[PDB]
RNA sequence: GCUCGUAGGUGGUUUGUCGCGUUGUUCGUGAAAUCUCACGGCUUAACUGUGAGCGUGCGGGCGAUACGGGCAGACUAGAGU
RNA sequence: UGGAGAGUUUGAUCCUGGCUCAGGACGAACGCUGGCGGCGUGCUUAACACAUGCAAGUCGAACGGAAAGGUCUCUUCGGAGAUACUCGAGUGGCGAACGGGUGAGUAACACGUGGGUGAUCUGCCCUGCACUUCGGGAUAAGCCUGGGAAACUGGGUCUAAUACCGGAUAGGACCACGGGAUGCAUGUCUUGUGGUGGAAAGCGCUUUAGCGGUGUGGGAUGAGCCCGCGGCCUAUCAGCUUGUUGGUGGGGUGACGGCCUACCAAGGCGACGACGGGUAGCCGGCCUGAGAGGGUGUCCGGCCACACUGGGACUGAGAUACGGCCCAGACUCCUACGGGAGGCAGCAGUGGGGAAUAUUGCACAAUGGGCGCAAGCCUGAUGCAGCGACGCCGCGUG
Ligand SMILES: [Mg+2]
Ligand SMILES: [Mg+2]
Ligand SMILES: [Mg+2]
Ligand SMILES: [Mg+2]
Ligand SMILES: [Mg+2]
Ligand SMILES: [Mg+2]
Ligand SMILES: [Mg+2]
Ligand SMILES: [Mg+2]
Ligand SMILES: [Mg+2]
Ligand SMILES: [Mg+2]
Ligand SMILES: [Mg+2]
Ligand SMILES: [Mg+2]
Ligand SMILES: [Mg+2]
Ligand SMILES: [Mg+2]
Ligand SMILES: [Mg+2]
Ligand SMILES: [Mg+2]
Ligand SMILES: [Mg+2]
Ligand SMILES: [Mg+2]
Ligand SMILES: [Mg+2]
Ligand SMILES: [Mg+2]
Ligand SMILES: [Mg+2]
Ligand SMILES: [Mg+2]
Ligand SMILES: [Mg+2]
Ligand SMILES: [Mg+2]
Ligand SMILES: [Mg+2]
Ligand SMILES: [Mg+2]
Ligand SMILES: [Mg+2]
Ligand SMILES: [Mg+2]
Ligand SMILES: [Mg+2]
Ligand SMILES: [Mg+2]
Ligand SMILES: [Mg+2]
Ligand SMILES: [Mg+2]
Ligand SMILES: [Mg+2]
Ligand SMILES: [Mg+2]
Ligand SMILES: [Mg+2]
Ligand SMILES: [Mg+2]
Ligand SMILES: [Mg+2]
Ligand SMILES: [Mg+2]
Ligand SMILES: [Mg+2]
Ligand SMILES: [Mg+2]
Ligand SMILES: [Mg+2]
Ligand SMILES: [Mg+2]
Ligand SMILES: [Mg+2]
Ligand SMILES: [Mg+2]
Ligand SMILES: [Mg+2]
Ligand SMILES: [Mg+2]
């Protein structure tokens with residue numbers, strides 16, 4: 054190459070996706086979303102359900118109690134925020 | 147310094163404060179200056195230390211608030227009264243001296259304390 | 268810098284060496300980046316094994332072998348192939 | 359130990375880097391006070407002077423190119439928004 | 441001691457959808473030694489080298505809805521009126 | 522591919538149900554006995570304190586100078602001469618952040634595992650695109666003095682540099698405006714326009730002896746940062762938090778971020794156990810068990826944390842910076858009393874504790890690492906040797 058090589062193609066990374074309900078929204082552009090998952094017990098073998106809590110960034114804070122949201126995880130946007138809003142699906146009844 | 151006076155201990159025996167019981171050097175001697183020997187009791191000590199509270203000890207005065215004359219007409223005066231606990235042979239029971247000491251210890255023959263002291267004035 | 272070095276993993280009186288590519292700032296008998304051969308200095312002449320293409324890739328990417336790995340590369344001819352020298356085999 | 363030479367070279371480096379950093383700081387504060395003064399005339403050339411000093415320091419290696427870029431962008435936006 | 445009931449666990453019949461659990465394949469990863477099969481060398485073994493298993497898992501793509509599950513419905517047997 | 526039971530309650534019986542035993546294992550100790558060889562292992566307690574010797578130096582093919590070597594050199598007949606190989610010391614470059622040690626602290630993204638880095642840095646290595654162009658000032662060393670018991674230090678000259686500074690030109694520095702592709706939202710990758718700018722160095726050569734440096738594209742390598750899952754006991758620990766949670770504007774970082782700052786909201790964590798107490802290096806691994814499981818983290822390997830205790834900065838690509846620096850505390854030592862020096866959880870060894878665990882040995886012969894154009898130098902890493910029946914295997918005492 055008689056000049057600078059631009060780059061070589063690479064496959065961009067794929068980020069995780071989760072869906073959960075909005076629990077708390079009074080956060081001034083942030084929302085709190087409850088996520089649940091199931092993991093098999095290491096010893097007894099039963100299937101159990103555990104609920105978590107993540108903080109999601111909301112550039113325009115429009116979300117109420119319920120308001121199912123699919124979240125995709127980002128860079129550390131804040132001290133305790135690692136998720137951003139993707140879209141609103143199955144709005145609160 | 148007289149009886150019932152309290153002094154700060156200037157060594158590492160573990161005692162903090164002692165109370166003068168008797169000024170040695172004669173019957174009915176009143177005041178103890180720098181270089182004078184004191185019978186005293188330990189009114190406070192570091193917990194779990196070598197010396198305990200209430201032990202009757204013998205000490206030498208090394209600092210006085212009251213100014214003391216010197217043969218050349220000069221005076222020396224400290225900001226606190228301090229003493230050093232000694233053995234019967236005039237050696238300190240501790241291993242080091244804290245703060246300066248007066249030069250009268252030289253003429254009172256307290257060479258070990260004089261050597262151990264950080265400064266002699 | 269990336270180096271190709273011999274790693275010894277034998278017993279006290281059987282000094283078997285493995286031709287491996289490892290980082291310079293590592294111990295001798297450590298976790299190398301990738302092992303690309305071995306060398307047993309206990310046969311009659313010796314036992315020399317070189318992959319000869321991963322070594323070529325590492326040489327083209329910047330890996331620099333030491334004196335014994337260099338001698339083994341010259342013996343196996345892979346160094347000559349990489350450098351364009353005529354004789355590609357001198358075993 | 360043969361590290362007294364290293365200590366001497368170290369202290370020489372402290373003096374050199376400290377001097378250049380303090381000069382850069384003084385230039386930055388001069389540009390800042392010009393920015394709040396809002397002359398908008400000599401600040402235009404003070405911006406260029408500060409950029410030259412800061413990327414000269416970056417080339418000298420006393421700082422990093424990332425820090426030089428950050429400070430140059432900050433001073434440029436500082437001149438811009440007024 | 442008995443009862444009620446919060447969370448929780450668990451749940452009737454049937455239809456459709458998803459395919460999360462479930463399961464299959466494929467790819468990447470799961471360092472080496474050490475554990476095992478098979479060999480090779482120290483007179484043999486201990487010791488050591490090589491090939492394959494191990495690494496019970498995880499991430500990605502591609503197949504299934506038989507069961508659990510999410511959603512959308514329906515029925516009366518459960519339950520209630 | 523792998524599952525043993527026996528004893529013991531009663532006048533005699535069957536259950537339930539404890540207690541004990543037969544087996545294996547160890548970084549082992551004790552008692553007695555004791556030949557050798559192959560291979561391994563050996564302060565588990567006091568992260569208690571240390572006498573002593575060695576553990577990081579190298580380059581004259583960067584530079585000024587010549588203390589020594591042989592030296593041609595004047596010749597003293599024991600003194601001269603850097604100009605010469607060579608080189609004490611000195612400037613400069615690199616290394617020194619690797620290697621070696623301990624498991625104290627740590628219940629933590631420390632460790633194992635799998636992702637993200639459109640949030641990143643990256644010397645020496647490879648390699649694409651170009652340059653390698655001009656001036657200046659002092660100083661080390663040396664010399665003359667001065668201070669101090671030393672440790673150390675001042676004043677006056679004096680000589681360089683691949684040391685320093687100032688320059689011309691150079692786009693992955695920035696700003697504004699755009700084009701072209703992409704989605705994963707901030708964005709991501711590449712050109713253009715106008716305004717800004719940013720470095721280099723010379724040295725050697727038995728004449729193809731060779732080295733270099735930077736301006737940047739792209740690889741290789743190392744690392745910084747975030748996330749999910751898993752690996753102790755305790756509720757006789759039930760309410761925890763205020764830079765705490767978020768947002769905004771700045772500052773800071775290689776990089777996102779209350780990391781810091783000014784203002785606004787009242788929020789964030791908790792019965793799926795926060796907060797608190799006890800204990801502990803994690804894992805691959807090791808032992809036992811048919812297995813599931815129970816115990817454990819020692820050889821070795823990967824990582825983490827620490828270097829007398831506690832705290833902090835700088836150099837540098839890169840610092841818990843063991844054999845670097847500053848300060849506070851304790852300890853030890855020298856002193857002329859004014860002041861100074863020191864840290865074996867490196868190798869070897871000493872004191873003390875314990876039932877108890879080893880030489881102040883050899884060599885860079887091989888491998889790895891560092892310095893040159895090298896020849897070469899260093900390496901208590903390493904390769905061995907020495908002591909112990911300490912463990913496995915094997916052979917004899919016919
Ligand atoms: Mg923000
Ligand atoms: Mg100033
Ligand atoms: Mg910035
Ligand atoms: Mg009842
Ligand atoms: Mg009852
Ligand atoms: Mg009762
Ligand atoms: Mg209920
Ligand atoms: Mg229910
Ligand atoms: Mg059902
Ligand atoms: Mg249900
Ligand atoms: Mg055999
Ligand atoms: Mg394996
Ligand atoms: Mg899959
Ligand atoms: Mg009914
Ligand atoms: Mg029984
Ligand atoms: Mg009976
Ligand atoms: Mg009975
Ligand atoms: Mg029964
Ligand atoms: Mg040097
Ligand atoms: Mg020299
Ligand atoms: Mg060099
Ligand atoms: Mg360095
Ligand atoms: Mg180190
Ligand atoms: Mg220990
Ligand atoms: Mg520990
Ligand atoms: Mg993890
Ligand atoms: Mg001078
Ligand atoms: Mg320019
Ligand atoms: Mg220059
Ligand atoms: Mg605040
Ligand atoms: Mg802010
Ligand atoms: Mg611990
Ligand atoms: Mg069993
Ligand atoms: Mg510490
Ligand atoms: Mg110690
Ligand atoms: Mg410390
Ligand atoms: Mg460096
Ligand atoms: Mg730096
Ligand atoms: Mg420190
Ligand atoms: Mg060091
Ligand atoms: Mg040390
Ligand atoms: Mg040792
Ligand atoms: Mg004992
Ligand atoms: Mg003992
Ligand atoms: Mg060597
Ligand atoms: Mg070698």
Ligand SMILES: [Mg+2]
Pocket residue numbers: none
């Ligand atoms: Mg024995």
